Amino acid sequence: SYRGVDLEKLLEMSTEDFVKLAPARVRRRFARGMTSKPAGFMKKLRAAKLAAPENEKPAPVRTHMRNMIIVPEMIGSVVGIYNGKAFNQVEIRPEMLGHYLGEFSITYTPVRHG
Amino acid sequence: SLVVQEQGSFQHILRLLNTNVDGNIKIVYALTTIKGVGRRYSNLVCKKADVDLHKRAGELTQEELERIVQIMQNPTHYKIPAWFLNRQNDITDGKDYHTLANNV
Amino acid sequence: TDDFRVLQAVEQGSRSHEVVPTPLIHQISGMRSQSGTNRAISDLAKLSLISKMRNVKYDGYRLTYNGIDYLALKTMLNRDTVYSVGNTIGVGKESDIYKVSDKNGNPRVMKIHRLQGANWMHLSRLAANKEYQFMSMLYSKGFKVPEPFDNSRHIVVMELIEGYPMRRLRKHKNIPKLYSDLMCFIVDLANSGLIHCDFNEFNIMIKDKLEDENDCGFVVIDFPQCISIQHQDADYYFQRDVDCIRRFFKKKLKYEPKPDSSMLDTEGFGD
Amino acid sequence: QCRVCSSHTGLIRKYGLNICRQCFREKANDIGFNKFR
Amino acid sequence: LDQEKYDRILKEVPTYRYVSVSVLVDRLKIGGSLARIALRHLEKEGIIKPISKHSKQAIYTRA
RNA sequence: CGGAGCCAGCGAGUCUAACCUUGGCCGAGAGGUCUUGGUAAUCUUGUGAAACUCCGUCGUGCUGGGGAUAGAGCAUUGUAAUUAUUGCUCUUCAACGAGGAAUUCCUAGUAAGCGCAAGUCAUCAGCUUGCGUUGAUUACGUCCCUGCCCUUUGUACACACCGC
C-alpha cells in the first residue's frame, strides 16, 4: 500500500493522480515540468515490458535518469540503473514508489578500515 | 500567591501509559518523561484538557490522567490538527499518527 | 652498500669541524673524480638534503633535517628495523610520530626528533638517547611501558600498542581495584624516587585482552614531567597525581575512596 | 566569469565588472579608487 | 504533610533578621519555586516586610 | 523559558528587467496572494538588529542547560535537491559537570560579548569585510624567556702535530 491503496488500483493510476497521492517533494517536482525524452524512454520501457514472457521477469531496461520518481506505471520492470560506471538490475517493487531511481544503485565501493 | 497546603494526598511517582512519571515536576515536564511526548505536546494536550500547568504532577487527579490519555488516543478529534503530530501522512495507512512511548 | 657507506663517511665528515666546505666532502669521501662527489652533493641539494652557505671567499655545505634519516634508515638497515615509512598519528612538540613497518610486516612507531648545522641534530640526538635510557630504566625496574626497539641516533623506533585513552573509557567493572592500582602505582613511583606530575587522563593507556581472564596491562607516557622526590615542589605534584585520579574517579567513575590515599609524608618511608 | 581577458583568478565578481585582481590594479587608474589612506 | 512544613516558615521568618529568596529555600523543606509564593503570602500577612523587589531576587525583613 | 519596552550605524537596490519591497488578506509557520513606493539623504528606512531593561515560570537536579543524531510531513529557489540546497511543524534528547601535555592575541571604546549590512549569493555560513549597541581587568616596565637585529673586537691553528 502506498496511501492505504490496493496494489493493482495503484498500478493503473496516471502520473498526475500519483502526484495527487504524493509527498510535497514529488508534487513540487512534477508541478514544474518534465523533459520530453523520458516519454520516449517510457515508450521503450513499455515496449520491453511487451517483450516479456508470461510468469517470468521482463526485459531489463538500462537507465541513466536517476532523479525520476518511480510512478506505479513502472512497477514490475527489471531496470539497470547507471551508477556513474555500471548498470545494476533491480525489479521495481510496490515498496519502491515515490523514490528516485538514484536511491537504488550504489555509486562507489565501500571503505574498509578495520 | 496563596500557599495552598495539602495533608498528604499526593503520590511520589505515578505511572501512566505503562511508563513511570515523577509526580513532583510540572505536569508538562513530568509527562515529557515518556517517549514520543515532548514539552509543547504535553502543554497543548493539557491546555485542551484545561489542566492547570503551574500545578505539580502530585496534585493531579487520575480523572485528568484519563483526559490526557483520551487526548493521546484522540489528538485529531480534540482540535489538535495534523501539523502537531509525529507521523503525518503515512505510507502504510495514509493517516496521521502520534507514535506513543512504548509503542515505537 | 657503497653509496650508503660514502653517505656514512660524509656523516662522519660532520664530526670534524663546523659548517663543512666543498673540498672536505670531496676528500673525506675519497672517491674517484669530480663526478661522484659533485653529482651526489647536487642530488643532496635538490632533495634539500644539503644547503650552500657562501660566506665570503668560503663555500660551505649546510645539512638540514632532510639528509640524515636515510643514514638512520641505513643504521636501521643494520639493526633489522623498518622497511616502509609513513602514517601520521600525532605531531608532537619535540617529536613527530609516524606509523611504519619492517621487512617482517609488523607496524611500528617512528618518533623523529626535531629539537641549524649541528645543534638541532645533536639536541635531537641527546633527547632520543635520554628518552631511550629512561625507557630502559622503566623497563629494567619493571614498569609496564612500551618496549623499545632502537634509538637511531635521533629517531626512536618502538612498538605499536593497541590502546585508547581513558577519556573515551566510560568505566570498568572492577573500579575499586582500578583505584587501588592507580594509588599503588604512584606509590611505586615514589618508591622509585620519582613523581610523574602529568598523571592525567590522556597519559594512562589501557590494553584490553579479554573479558573473562582479565589479564591486561597499562602504558604510562609522561617523560618530560617526571621529577625526583628531592626537588622543591614534589609534595603537591604527588598530591596532584593522587587527586587527579580521585577527581576523575569521582567525576567519571563516580567512585570515592574508602581507604585514605597516600600522602608524601606517607611515602617518605618508602625508597 | 571573466568576460574581458579570460582572467578568472581573483575577480572583483562584485558589480559585474569582473576584472582579476592582477588586471584590476592595472586598470585601477581608470575608474578612480586610488590611494588616500 | 501540610501542618509539618508550613508553620516552620512562621517560626523561622520572625527569627531571621534577613529573609530573601535563597535564604528561605535553605531550610531544606521546600522548593525554590513555591518559596516565593510563601514570600508573597508573608507580604500579605505582614511578617515579611518589603525592602526591595526584583523579578529574580527580593529583599525583605522580619516583623 | 513566557511575556512586555523597542536603541543604532555602514551599506545596497530593478531597462530594455523581475532588484530592494511598504501596505492589505490567507496560512501554526514555512510561505502564498493582491498591489504600491523607490534608479535612490526621497521608497524599502527611523532598516523599531542582537546583546540590553523590567516582570512572571523554573529551582540546581546531564535540569525546564545543551542540541548532536534520527523519524514524519509541509513549503521555497533551482531543469535536476538522491549522499537529505534550504526554510517550517511535532517528535527522537547523544557525548559534554570549566577541560592535559602544549598553543594564540591584546592596553580605551582597545579587549570581550553582541547582532546588522556589503561581497562571495540561483539556496544556505560555521567564509571574508565594514558597521553600530553594551562595555571590563591590568601595564604604561623589562630585555629575564622567545627571537630579531645593531655593533665592539679576543681571532682565522691562514689549514700545525698526532695517536688513528
Distances (CA, A) of C208 to C201, D15, E41: 17, 63, 62
List where CATH 3.30.200.20 sits in chain C.
68-159
Among C21, C22, C25, C23, which Cα is nearest to C9's?
C25
Structural domains of chain E, ranges and CATH numbers in brackets = 1-63 (1.10.10.10)
- Secondary-structure breakdown of chain E: helix, strand, coil percentages, each rounded to the nearest 5: 40, 15, 45
- In this structure, what C-alpha cell is assigned to residue C37? 662527489
Kindly report the length of chain D: 37
Distances (CA, A) of E44 to B2, C168, E58: 9, 55, 15
- Determined by cryo-EM
Q: Does A94 touch chain B (CB under 8 A)?
A: no
Q: Write down which residues 188-227 in C have CB closer than 7 A to strand F.
A: 198, 200, 202, 224-225
**CATH architecture of the domain with range C68-159:** 2-Layer Sandwich (3.30)
Phi-psi region of C163 (alpha: psi -120 to 50; beta: other; left: phi over 0): beta
Q: Do B92 and A1 touch (CB under 8 A)?
A: yes
Q: Do B5 and E37 touch (CB under 8 A)?
A: no
* Nearest-CA distance E7 → chain B (Å): 11
Q: Write down which residues 63-102 in B have CB closer than 7 A to strand F.
A: 81-91, 98-99
Residue C198: active-site member: yes
Is the pair D, B in contact (3+ CB pairs within 8 Å)? no
For residue C228, the cross-strand partners are: C194
Superfamily of domain C163-266 in the CATH hierarchy: Transferase(Phosphotransferase) domain 1 (1.10.510.10)
Nucleotide nearest to E58 (CA to C1'): F55
Smallest CA–CA distance from B88 into chain A, residue: A23
Residue with the three cell numbers 504535553: B42
Residue with the three cell numbers 565578481: D13
Residue with the three cell numbers 629494567: C140
Q: Write down which residues 237-266 in C have CB closer than 7 A to strand F.
A: 251-252
Q: Does B94 touch chain A (CB under 8 A)?
A: yes
Integer-rounded Cα Rg, in Å, for chain C is 24
Q: What is the three-class DSSP state of A82?
A: strand
Nucleic strand F within 7 A of Cβ A103? yes
Residue B87: Cβ within 10 Å count: 14
CA C123 to C1' F3, whole Å: 68
Q: Does A98 touch chain B (CB under 8 A)?
A: yes
**Is D31 known to sit in a ligand binding site?**
no
Q: Does B82 touch chain A (CB under 8 A)?
A: no
Structural domains of chain D, ranges and CATH numbers in brackets = 1-37 (4.10.830.10)
Confirm if C86 and C98 have CB atoms less than 8 A apart: yes
Chain B partners within 8 Å of A4 (Cβ): 92-95
Q: What is the three-class DSSP state of B52?
A: coil
Confirm if A91 and A81 have CB atoms less than 8 A apart: no
Nucleic strand F within 7 A of Cβ C122? no
Q: Is C198 exposed, middle or buried (0-12, 13-18, 19+ CB in 10 A)?
A: middle
Chain A partners within 8 Å of B89 (Cβ): 23
Nucleic strand F within 7 A of Cβ E21? yes
Distances (CA, A) of C235 to C187, C190, C192, C224, C249: 13, 11, 15, 18, 21
Residue C113 DSSP label? -
For residue C101, the cross-strand partners are: C84, C107
Protein contacts on strand F: list nucleotides below 7 Å from a Cβ: 13, 28-29, 54-60, 63-64, 71-76, 78-83, 89-93, 96-98, 100-103, 119-121, 156-158
The secondary structure of chain D as a DSSP string is ---SSS--TTB--GGG---BHHHHTTTHHHH------
Give φ, ψ of B37 to 5 degrees: -130, 125
Nucleic strand F within 7 A of Cβ E32? yes
